[PDB]
Design a protein around this ligand. Structure first.
Ligand code: ZN
Ligand code: ZN
Lengths: 663, 113, 72, 93, 131
């Protein structure tokens, strides 16, 4: 009986207590990564064959380290034996122990792992990637165990929400160090595994939350120094947690040492290429696909996504002032200027303009436009500004005093109200009533609504499943036709709207759409097919009826952006807005039976139909950059013949620098 | 838990050589994933020292594939005639998964020292 | 009935704003606060007390000569 | 100025990010403070430091843009001011 | 936290011990006798909604009597309430205890059985009839 515990305690003197009953196995619910030949997936199964012994501390209090003992086939025993003998050196491996025991008439095999943890990485990843606040208990246990927060916190209702209670970000961030240690130890193991000539697939559910591996179930043999570890599913599933928990935040310190200060990067440095390559080697060594830090050198769009993902990850280390337009000092007719010649994207690395010329004589309309629209001059000729009303990165103030915009209240139509109460409406307690008014706003209304961008955080996407769903989404989109069009085929409804800033100082869009011949417009297109033009966006306050008293804003993009995005996208857009019976139902009027046809089409013939509809909270402010880039690529996919490859990348860069992360 | 090779593949002899024309005929040993789109080969096994090109006709036998090769792999299988040196040729540009699969098949099929 | 309170509060804020009160800054903030609170109230009594607190603003100034319009 | 030419000549390629140009060559700062607490943490006395350089306060105004003396930015007097104060300073050498 | 463990012990002998991990339920394999309208039979199912507390003896050694606490619907709560009130007399009934508790914002129902055993008759019968 207790001889079992005495044997299992081996020589490491533990005050070790039994947690399955006497000598029988235990039943638990764990998450696994399964791919035999018949079943496959990543889900919660029911592990059953393990006698688990909770190791005890001094003072007879409990401590989180356990011994796990398994029983299986003798052949399995010798296999694990020899392989552990091969790999018994690198600190990434948990100290096994092989022995045999008899219950009754049975010298039965037994494998003991020493000083593990209660959960594996797969459990953490599953908890965070399949969250439901009704039974998030395992997550609670992990957080309280590793001293992130303490129990009394979880009664603070809405603790898990993101928009509500933003401290959850810090609480999650407290796991970064441990997640990092896991990666470092995985690299060490991959090293030892290649050296000792072993082949085998690495998975998540074979690693305690200290990084120590175990469970060589189906590794094989080869000549030493020629073993290939497989790390696809591992990293691909682990990815999102890296940015959710802010793993690499240690890298920014003086020497990856959380106690020391921050590195002082100099203000002028902006290249940052070899640093990215060195981080990629330090943390992802055995990833089996090329990685270009500057997406200019990518091959097709899929490589663009693949590399932009890693760029999203690594760019959360370097200083934030080193992003945005790269300006340089150029001369025209003996006069020095300051114009932008490139960008530095958080995702696409560094991009340099191709057509730049110092020492010019005169500028014609096209260049006058592209120079007046740059933020370079506007920012270089303005006062520094430190706005504490927000947390977003400020830049410069243009004029000496900040303007405060207010929103007036609506107007009352007394005659109609008297009519409606005369005919017996608006009764007390009734159902129909007044709920939609013209809510007024006070002074610092604009900035208090622009501040809502703080819900946008860097997000790292599961690259493989994304690379699959992008194909399926594209397939949802194969009934239309797109491609460039000349200037003399665009269709502008209402040529009498605002032209953004600074062009709104000299008239509406009619002027610029009426003062540039077709040659200038086609030349502007051809120019942006080889350069980058950052622009300024203006924020305007709406004034309309509603039922919630938050202000609402809409962004007004300069004419330089629309005048070209139109020629790039209008053909496909109008082709979408003229198709019936598709999935996207833009352009289908609801009158003259349209509603009926739409309902009939969507209820085509599903076997046992139910309906369902959902809702995204903060849709336009919380969408992460990667999915926006993916959407732009899916839209540009219709351009296989009109444009050439560098042209498509430069169009992507322009659209990003103009509508994704601009001033 | 997670297994790595439910199915393996079969073996062919074919042509290979040091240059596109030095590909003479029947001296190559190819491992081939006969996929959906034709017989796709992965690794080449020979005793010839090094060969930069293999030459196998297409799935429709029109053109003979010009496939540059890895630096051969060194190992010493054994037979009744004692030790026997062989060289394993990977098609350059192969992911770790296909390397692992070919190695599993070969090592489980053929005895080494 | 409550709808009548909401409606007259709308009209009152309109009058205030057209009497240039938004030039001053903290006062306009308070007026906007009371108006938006009245528009969302549920019971009549506290809406009435906010209404009187907000009318006190218009009464505290001498731009509107009430002794004229209070002729019926 | 000369200083712009200086930091451009310093660069190893003559191209520099945009965000640092006003950060290192501006001659006037403008600070926007919501309440008194945030005022205490940063704009304190007649000189303070920001962006690793020293600044001297030169005028202070409130939401309505009426001059406010540094004397009445008390803790107790604070609830009598249009409160998003705007402080303009000058670069001290 | 040590609320459940204590405010459950009620009054009889503060010598409990969670054999639960926390304040969460437990997963076990038991044999049941099930006839609702759709499924029927006598087999081993997976009971899940019970916080089980091993009651302890003097000298801090263990003893086989446990307290079992369930959570279900409020209507279920009142139903079991009134019926136990009716039958609370014959010694054949285990002393229940009804109360409510809050984890976060939830005054949630809770039914506690006092001094049970680890297995039921159905377990013994199943073990002996499916050996
Ligand atoms: Zn790439
Ligand atoms: Zn095109």
């Amino acid at each position: 009986a207790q001889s079992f515990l005495n044997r299992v305690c081996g020589v490491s003197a533990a005050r070790l207590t039994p947690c399955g009953t006497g000598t029988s196995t235990d039943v638990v619910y764990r998450a696994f990564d399964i791919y035999n030949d018949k079943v496959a997936g990543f889900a919660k199964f029911l592990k059953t064959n393990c006698c688990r012994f909770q190791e005890k501390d001094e003072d007879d209090n409990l401590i989180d380290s356990y011994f796990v003992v398994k029983r299986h086939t003798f052949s399995n025993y010798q296999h694990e034996e020899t392989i552990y003998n091969l790999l018994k050196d690198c600190p990434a491996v948990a100290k096994h122990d092989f022995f045999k025991f008899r219950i009754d008439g049975d010298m039965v095999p037994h494998i003991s792992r020493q000083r593990l943890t209660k959960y594996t990485m797969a459990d953490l990843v599953y908890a965070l990637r399949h969250f439901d606040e009704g039974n998030c208990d395992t997550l609670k246990e992990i957080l309280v165990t590793y001293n992130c927060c303490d129990d009394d916190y979880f009664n603070k209702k809405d603790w898990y929400d993101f928009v509500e209670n933003p401290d959850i970000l810090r609480v999650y961030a407290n796991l970064g160090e441990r997640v990092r240690q896991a990666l470092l130890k995985t690299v060490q193991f991959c090293d030892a595994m290649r050296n000792a000539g072993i082949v085998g697939v690495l998975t998540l559910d074979n690693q305690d939350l200290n990084g120590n591996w175990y469970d060589f179930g189906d590794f094989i043999q080869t000549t030493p120094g020629s073993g290939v570890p497989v790390v696809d599913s591992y990293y691909s599933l682990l990815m999102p947690i890296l940015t959710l928990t802010r793993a690499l935040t240690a890298e920014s310190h003086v020497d990856t040492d959380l106690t020391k200060p921050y590195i002082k990067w100099d203000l002028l440095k902006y290249d940052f290429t070899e640093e990215r390559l060195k981080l990629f080697d330090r943390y992802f060594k055995y990833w089996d696909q090329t990685y270009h830090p500057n997406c200019v050198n990518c091959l097709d769009d899929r490589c663009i996504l693949h590399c932009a993902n890693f760029n999203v990850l690594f760019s959360t280390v370097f200083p934030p002032t080193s992003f945005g337009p790269l300006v340089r000092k150029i001369f025209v007719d003996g006069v020095p200027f300051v114009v932008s010649t490139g960008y530095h994207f958080r995702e696409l690395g560094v991009v340099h303009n191709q057509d730049v010329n110092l020492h010019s004589s005169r500028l014609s309309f096209k260049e006058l436009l592209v120079y007046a629209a740059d933020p370079a001059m506007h920012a270089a000729s303005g006062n520094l500004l430190l706005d504490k009303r927000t947390t977003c990165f400020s830049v410069a103030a243009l004029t000496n005093n900040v303007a405060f915009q207010t929103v007036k209240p609506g107007n009352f139509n007394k005659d109609f109200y008297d009519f409606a109460v005369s005919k017996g409406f608006f009764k007390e307690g009734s159902s129909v009533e007044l709920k939609h008014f013209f809510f007024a706003q006070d002074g610092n209304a604009a900035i208090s609504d622009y501040d809502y961008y703080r819900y946008n955080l860097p997000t790292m996407c599961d690259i493989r499943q994304l690379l699959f769903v992008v194909e399926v989404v594209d397939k949802y989109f194969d009934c239309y036709d797109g491609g460039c069009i000349n200037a003399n085929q665009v269709i502008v409804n209402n040529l009498d709207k605002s032209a953004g800033f600074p062009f709104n100082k000299w008239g509406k869009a009619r002027l610029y759409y009426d003062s540039m011949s077709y040659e200038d417009q086609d030349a502007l297109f051809a120019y942006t097919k080889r350069n980058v033009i950052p622009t300024i966006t203006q924020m305007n306050l709406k004034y309309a009826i509603s039922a919630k008293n938050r202000a609402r804003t809409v962004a007004g993009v300069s004419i330089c952006s629309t005048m070209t995005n139109r020629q790039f996208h209008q053909k496909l857009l109008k082709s979408i807005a003229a198709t019936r019976g598709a999935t996207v139902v833009i352009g289908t009027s609801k009158f003259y039976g349209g509603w009926h046809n739409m309902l009939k089409t969507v209820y085509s013939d599903v076997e046992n139909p139910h309906l369902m509809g959902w809702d995204y909270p903060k849709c336009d402010r919380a969408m992460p950059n990667m999915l926006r880039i993916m959407a732009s690529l899916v839209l540009a996919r219709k351009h296989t013949t009109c444009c050439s490859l560098s042209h498509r990348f430069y169009r992507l860069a322009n659209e990003c620098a103009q509508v994704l992360s601009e001033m | 838990n997670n297994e790595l090779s439910p199915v393996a593949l079969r073996q062919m002899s074919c042509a290979a050589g040091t240059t596109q024309t030095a590909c003479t005929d029947d001296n190559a040993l190819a491992y081939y994933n006969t996929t959906k789109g034709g017989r796709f080969v992965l690794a080449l096994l020979s005793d010839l020292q090094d060969l930069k090109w293999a030459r196998f006709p297409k799935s429709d036998g029109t053109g003979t594939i010009y496939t540059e090769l890895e630096p051969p792999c060194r190992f010493v299988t054994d037979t009744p005639k004692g030790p026997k040196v062989k060289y394993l040729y990977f098609i350059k540009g192969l992911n770790n998964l296909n390397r692992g699969m070919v190695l599993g098949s070969l090592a489980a099929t053929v005895r080494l020292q | 009935k409550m709808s009548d309170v909401k409606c007259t509060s709308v009209v009152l804020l309109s009058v205030l704003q057209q009497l240039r009160v938004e030039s001053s800054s903290k006062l306009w903030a308070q007026c906007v606060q009371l108006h938006n609170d009245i528009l969302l109230a549920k019971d009549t009594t506290e809406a009435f007390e906010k209404m009187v607190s907000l009318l006190s603003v218009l009464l505290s100034m001498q731009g509107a000569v009430d002794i004229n319009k209070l002729c019926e | 100025n000369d200083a712009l030419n200086n930091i451009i000549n310093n660069a190893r390629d003559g191209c520099v990010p945009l965000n640092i140009i006003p950060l290192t060559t501006a001659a006037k700062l403008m600070v926007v403070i919501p309440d008194y607490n945030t005022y205490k943490n940063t704009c304190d006395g007649t000189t303070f430091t920001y962006a690793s350089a020293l600044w001297e306060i030169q005028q202070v105004v409130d939401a309505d843009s009426k001059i406010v003396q540094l004397s009445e930015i008390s803790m107790d007097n604070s609830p009598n001011l249009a409160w998003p104060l705007i402080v303009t300073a000058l670069r001290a050498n």
